């Protein structure tokens, strides 16, 4: 009983469809194509993890542009926004910076204020003053 | 040290685990003390009753709060 592979055609297409848009002989020849496709998938998943880093770095660069406009460096802006209990991820913060320049100038005003309050309290050397924006609220 | 960490329940990182302060335990902890952070458990509201088991939570200052999020 001899058995040969009849469907080999389709076996090949499932590789070759992913190779269509390559340059050179990689987009035809099953040998070359197979290796190239595999490399393409691997590169793809690795890039799926990378993409998230890339985007977050983008957002940080944009937020830095936006802050620097208002004479406020990036770290100051971010941590002094945290110290106001305002938790907005960098995605949203960048989008505000682009599409909501007003609200962003407000946020920047807040941060700047909170920072100055911090310096004031550190130089003051007493427990009595609590800056208006340096107050820490608990959940209700 | 790998074994000591395994038998302290410390397998997963940045997860808290609670242990008696008896010498038996302190011995192992002493072996791995550079791999860990040890902070005393505090009970402001005291130990939980059986009505309070579902509402218990552990705050980072190392303190166990019995009533979490009333209404």
């Amino acid at each position: 009983l001899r058995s040969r592979v009849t469907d080999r055609y389709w076996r090949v297409q499932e590789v070759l469809k992913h190779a269509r848009h390559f340059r050179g002989r990689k987009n035809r020849c099953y040998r070359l194509a197979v290796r190239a496709v595999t490399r393409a998938f691997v590169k793809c998943t690795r890039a799926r993890r990378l993409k998230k880093r890339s985007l977050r770095t983008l957002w940080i660069n944009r937020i830095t542009a936006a802050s620097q406009e208002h004479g406020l460096k990036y770290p100051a802006f971010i941590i002094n926004l945290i110290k106001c209990q305002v938790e907005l991820n960098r995605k949203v913060l960048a989008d505000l910076a682009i599409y909501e320049p007003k609200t962003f100038k407000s946020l920047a005003a807040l941060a700047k204020r909170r920072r100055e309050e911090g310096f004031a309290a550190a130089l003051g050397d007493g427990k009595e003053p609590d800056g208006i924006f340096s107050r820490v609220v608990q959940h209700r | 040290e790998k074994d000591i960490i395994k038998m302290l329940g410390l397998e997963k990182a940045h997860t808290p685990q609670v242990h008696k302060n008896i010498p038996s335990v302190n011995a192992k902890l002493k072996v791995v003390k550079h791999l860990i952070r040890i902070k005393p458990l505090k009970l402001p509201q005291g130990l939980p009753t059986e009505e309070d088991m579902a509402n218990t939570c552990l705050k980072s200052n190392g303190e166990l709060v019995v009533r979490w999020l009333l209404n």
Binding site: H18, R20, H21, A40, F41, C44, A66, E69, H70, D95, A97, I98, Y99, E100, P101, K102, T103, K105 | -
Partner: protein, 148 residues
């Protein structure tokens, strides 16, 4: 892969869910064999579930054809014009039910990479940043070295 395939922005057909929600699935056609084992699940589904399904969704027309086939299919068809083919071949009643549900709740848009998770017309309320938006204006509106 993403460079490999086509892509689209996130959209609704006919701004669905804005004014009111319209179930996008239009008709559903089953083809199965009374005799063949491959269609077994699909038969059971037609017995018990189809009826109830038809009440739960008044807006979709369901055509059931017994015919001599080896591979039972369900053809979903949408308001969009979109036609989506499926094979119910050799599945449970449970599996088919879940599948028919997926078909019921889909938009009929093509399934491909979606470029970004949100879609907004007028994202920009209160302005959109441009190089001048944060710059101060001067007196007379002179340039840096300009004299008057």
């Amino acid at each position: 892969t993403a460079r490999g395939t086509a892509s689209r922005f996130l959209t609704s057909v006919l701004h669905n869910g804005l004014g009111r929600y319209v179930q996008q699935l239009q008709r559903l056609s089953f083809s199965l064999s009374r005799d063949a084992p491959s269609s077994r699940g699909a038969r059971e589904f037609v017995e018990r579930e189809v009826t109830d399904f038809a009440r739960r969704n008044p807006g979709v027309v369901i055509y059931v054809n017994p015919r001599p086939c080896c591979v039972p299919r369900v053809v979903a068809e949408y308001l969009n014009g979109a036609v989506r083919e499926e094979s119910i071949h050799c599945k449970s009643v449970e599996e088919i039910a879940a599948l028919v549900q997926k078909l019921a709740d889909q938009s009929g848009l093509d399934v491909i990479r979606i470029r970004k998770p949100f879609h907004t017309d007028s994202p920009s309320i209160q302005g959109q940043w441009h190089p001048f938006t944060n710059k101060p204006t001067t007196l007379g509106g002179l340039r840096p070295r300009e004299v008057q």
